[model samples]
Target: ASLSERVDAPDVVEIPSAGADLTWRAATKEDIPALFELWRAAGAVDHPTSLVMLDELEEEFDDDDFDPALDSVIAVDSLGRVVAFGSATVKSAHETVVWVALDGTVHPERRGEGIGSSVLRWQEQRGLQHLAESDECLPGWLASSAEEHAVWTIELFHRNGYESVRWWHELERDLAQPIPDVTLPEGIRIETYGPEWSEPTRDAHNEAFRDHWGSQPEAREDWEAAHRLSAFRADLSFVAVARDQDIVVAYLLSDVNEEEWEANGYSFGFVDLLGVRRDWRGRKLAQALLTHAMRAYRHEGLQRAVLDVDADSPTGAVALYEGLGFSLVNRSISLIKQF
Candidate 1:
C-alpha cells in the first residue's frame, strides 16, 4: 500500500477486548479520576522513581482542542474499574513534520493480559486518524516516551514497530540546603516572570531551544495557552532580560503540583522549562535563573526542585545542572513509529 493509503484512518477504531470480562470504549472527561488511578497504579511499577502528576491529565481533558471520543481510549472491568487507558495528541508547529504522541499505561495487576496491547492498538488507530485530520502536508510520526525502568513498556513499543530515537534524564536537588547565590552576567537584570514578559519569554524559548532535539518553534497561541496553567508559579519563575535592550534572553519556568508531593514524599517545584539564548550562553544566565528558582522554592516551603534534561544537550545543560547540585534520578527513552 502507498504511504497515503497506509495513513488513511479507518472508519472505525475496532476496539480490542483484553478478556471476556473486559469492556473497551472511548474515554470521556468523567473517566479522568479512574484514569489517573490506572496511571498511578501502572506508574508505581513502571516508573515509580519519578513523579506522576494528575494536573497535566486534568489540563489535557480541559483543552478546547481535545476530543475525548477521538483522542482517548479506556478499558474497564465488570466493576467499572479502569484497567488500561491511552491519550493521543497532535500539536506541532508544522515546520517539516507532525508528530502525534500516544501515551498510556495498564494497571500493574493487569500486566500479563493483552490489555496493554489493546490500548496501544487503539492509540495507533487513533494516531493515524489524528495525522489524517492534520491539515499540514508535512509527513507525520507516531511517538511515545518511556522510562528505562519500564522494560515492559519499552518492549511493547518495540514489538509494535516503534524504534528508540532519543534519551533524557530527570534530575532533582534538595532545597533544604542553601542554594548557591548566582549573579546575572553584566548588563543583565533578573525579573520575576509576569504577564508583560510572556511574549518576550516565548521568544526567548524559541531562540534558546532552536537547536534542541525534536524541538519546534512554539506559536504564540500555543505559548499563551500553555502559560495559563494555574500550576505555573509566576513568583518563582524568572526571566533574565538584557538591560540595554530590555529583551528577555533567558528564562527558568517553575510549576508545582501538590498532587505529586504525596508520591514524592516531599513538596517540590518542578523546573518546567529552562533556557538561554545562544548569543547569551556562557554568561551564567541559565545558572542564575535556576538558582533564583531554587531560592524561591525554599522560601515557599518546597523541599526540593526537579527538572528533566536531554542527556546529550547541545548546551551542556546536564553538566550545568550537575555543577549546580542536581543529581540524576531517572532516564527516559523517546521512541517513534514512522509510517
Candidate 2:
C-alpha cells in the first residue's frame, strides 16, 4: 500500500526515503530549532528560518488554521536530526480558488536520494485528505516557489503531475536612486501608520486584493495578528487616505529584520504588503505609496528596498514597479494538480 494508504486515515504517516532509512513523523513544537538548522543547511536562507527566530516561528504556528500536530511532518536521521520537513494547510473558506497549499525543504547534503519526491507525494496525499474533510469538495492542491532559485523543487512538482498555473516576481530598488516624486490624485493624502490604523488598513487590503487569484478575505483576528504580531515596522509603513471621507484607500506595510540583514552585513527594508483599492487603482496611489516607502527607508538609513509582485497581474503591476526603478531579481511559479 502507498504511504498515504498505509496510514489508512488522517493521522501520523511514516514515509521512508526510497534509498535512505530516514523516518517521517508528525512535527511537534520542539522541532522548531532543528527545522531552522535543516533549512539553513538546505539553502532556505531567504525564508522565515533566516528572517525570524524561534519565538516568531512559534507565534506563526500558533494560528488557528495551523495545527502543527496535524499539518506538519518531519523526516529524521537515526540520531534524531531533521533531514527534511513538509507541511500543508487548507485555504480559508473565503478563498475558493485553491483547496490546499504545501511547502517543504530537504537538507542540502541529502538531495537526489528521493527525499524530495517522497515528501512531496506524502504532502499531496495529506492535502487531498484535508480536502475530503472540508465542507466542500475542492478540485485541486497548489504548490509554489521561486523558479530562479527553486529549480529542483519546480522539477519535482512537474514530475509529480503538478503544472504551472501562475507566476510571480521579486523586485528590488537601490536606495541610492532618487526617490520618485509621484503625485497622487487630488483628495488623497498620505498619512503616518500606527496601531490606530490597523482595522481600516485590513479592510483596505482585503478590498485591494479581492479580485486577485487565490486571495481570501482575512478574518479580523488573523488580520490584526498578521500586522501586529510579526516583524511589522509601523514607522516605515504608510497609508494613502481619501481626505474627504477619512478612509484609507491604499497602503504600504514595511518591515525590517535587523538580525536577518545584519547576519549578511547589510541594512535593508522590505515592503511586506502593498495595496490599492479596486476603485482607486488609476490614481497612481501605488506609485506614490512606494515612493514614500523608499524615502522612509532611506531616512531610516536602510540601503535598499525590496518587494514581490504577481508577474501576471491583470493591473500591470509588474510594469508599474519596473517603471519606478525596480528590477526583477527573481521569478516564482505556482503549480497545481486536480484531485
Candidate 3:
C-alpha cells in the first residue's frame, strides 16, 4: 500500500432528467427483465456481432463483489421501458492496477439525448469512490469498453477525460474452412482439456500474460468461477503438454453461448483463453492447441469459432489468427482514466 490518498467518491450523484416523462433509479432484483431488454436493445445496434445473453446478465447478481441495487442504475420512460442504464464495479484484486469497470448503454433510439454523458459522470464518480475505498496502494484506473462502432460512447469517454488505450478484435473462423495442421515440437503433444488441468492452466495463463497490457493474474476463485460457467465445453478445449515432463505448456480453452446461436445467426464455439508458457514459446504449440480445438468444434457441428485478441498484443496474435483463416468481425475499444 502506498501513502498517497485516493480522491473520495462523490457524495451524491445527480440523476439527469432527460425529460419529465423519464424516471431514474438504482437497479433491484425485479429489474432483471428491464435491464436485459435495455442491453439487448442497445447491443442489437451497437454490437450486432455478438448478442448479450440473459444468463450472462444473470451472473451479475451472483457475483460477490456486485450489488445489483447499489452498483447499478436505469432510466425508464413513462411506459416503464428502460431507456438508459449503467453500472460500475471495482476489481477485487490489487496485483497490478486497482482497476474499476464502468459499463452500460443507452438504447439506440435514445442516443444523442445527452443521457449518456450524465450516466458516464455518475459511473465515473462511483468508480473513483471504489478506488478510494481500496486499502491497497496500487495505482487505479477507471475503464470502460465500447464496440468500435459505438461512436457515441467513444466521444463520451473522450469528453469525460478518458483516453482510448487498447483495442480488442473479435475474430471468427469458419469451421467449414480448412484448418492448418500444425505439429508441435517433439517434446510436446496436444491433449483434450480436463478438470485436472484447470489450476495449472490458470497458472500458465497468468505467467504467459505477465507482460501483456492490462492483464492481472486471475485468482483461483475467479478462475474457477469463469471456467465453470455453463457455457464452458471441456470437450472442445485442448492443452499442449510436454510429453516427457508431463507438464502443460500451452492451452486453448473453448466454450459456447448457445443462447446467442440464433441471435448471431450461427452456432459457434468461443476460444475463451489461449496461451503458451513463456519458456515454451516458438514451438508451434499455440497453433497445435488451437487446431485441435477447431477440429473438435467442427466435429460438434459448430458453424464457426470465435475469439477476441488484443490488436497490439506482443504475441502477434492477430497475425497468428489471420494465418489460421480467422478474420476480424468486430472490434471494441477500452478507454481509461488513470488515478
1-339, model 1: which lDDT tens digit per residue?
Answer: 333455778877777766788888888888878877877788788777554556667778877667787788788888988888887887745565678889888888888778778888888998888777676666678999898978899999999999988899988899987678877777888899989999998988988787788787888876776777777778888988886469999998888877678777778999998988888889888888888889889888899998899998877988999999999877999989886
Which numbered prediction scores highest in TM-score against the true structure? 3
Better of 2 and 3 by lDDT: 3
The 10-residue segment of model 1 with minimum total lDDT is 1-10
lDDT (10s digit) by residue, model 2, range 127-156: 767665554533445565535566777788
TM-score of 2: 0.88
Residue 47, candidate 1: alpha-carbon lDDT = 76
Global lDDT scores for all candidate models: 0.82, 0.76, 0.83
Tell me the lDDT of candidate 3: 0.83
Angstrom error at residue 224, model 2: 2.2
Candidate 2 at residue 45, lDDT?
Answer: 38
CA deviation > 4 Å runs, candidate 2: 1-20, 44-56, 137-139, 243-245, 260-266
> Clashes per prediction?
0, 0, 0
Rank by TM-score, highest first. 3, 1, 2
Off by over 4 Å in 1: 1-11, 49-54, 135-139, 176-178, 228-230, 243-245
Q: How many backbone clashes does candidate 3 have?
A: 0
TM-score of 1: 0.89
Candidate 3 lDDT, 143-182, residue by residue in tens: 9888888887899899999999999999989999888898
